Amino acid sequence: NSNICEVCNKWGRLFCCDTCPRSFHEHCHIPSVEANKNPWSCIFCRIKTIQERCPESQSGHQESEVLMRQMLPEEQLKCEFLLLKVYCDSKSCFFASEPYYNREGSQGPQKPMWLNKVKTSLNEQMYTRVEGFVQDMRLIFHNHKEFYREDKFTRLGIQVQDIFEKNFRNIFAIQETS
Ligand SMILES: [Zn+2]
Ligand SMILES: [Zn+2]
Ligand SMILES: [Zn+2]
Secondary structure, eight states, rough: OOOOOTTOOOOOSEEEEESSOEEEETTTTSSSOOOOOOSSSOHHHHHHHHHHGGGGGSSOOOOHHHHOOOOOOHHEEEEHHHHHHTTTGGGGGGSOOOOOOOOOOOOOOOOOOHHHHHHHHHTTTTTSHHHHHHHHHHHHHHHHHHHTTTTTTHHHHHHHHHHHHHHHHTTTBOOOOO
């Protein structure tokens, strides 16, 4: 197995996947690595299994249909994995914890949002459809773009949104377009 966490790329107290060489800190894995379970399969393996069991799940889909899906166990897992893929990028640090807004010439957003809040929300089964999760994730980046205006720091929102959107299209097998 790897000797660094797959998400944060640091060593420490790591849990090893039994079906692939990935390793994780307890709370870097989403969901948090489970107490017992020998063997244990990580989220990457669990997602691969879903795809392998239903190869047709990789044919293209319309985003509008995906968003209306209820959060049954497989859709719950897919959103957990999508959230984890964002945390895997080091630029996610900027969006992880609760922001505050005090900049001359800008007003804070009406509805602040951050990754750890989305994480808690998923853990607590607060989203009934994929749409709820996706709206909160997109809101993180939209709030950032709006607040930072022409400061070059706005680009961090663009960058992390692009990681989100690429992984959304991959995980949910969104139909490719130009
Ligand atoms: Zn980690
Ligand atoms: Zn694995
Ligand atoms: Zn099938």
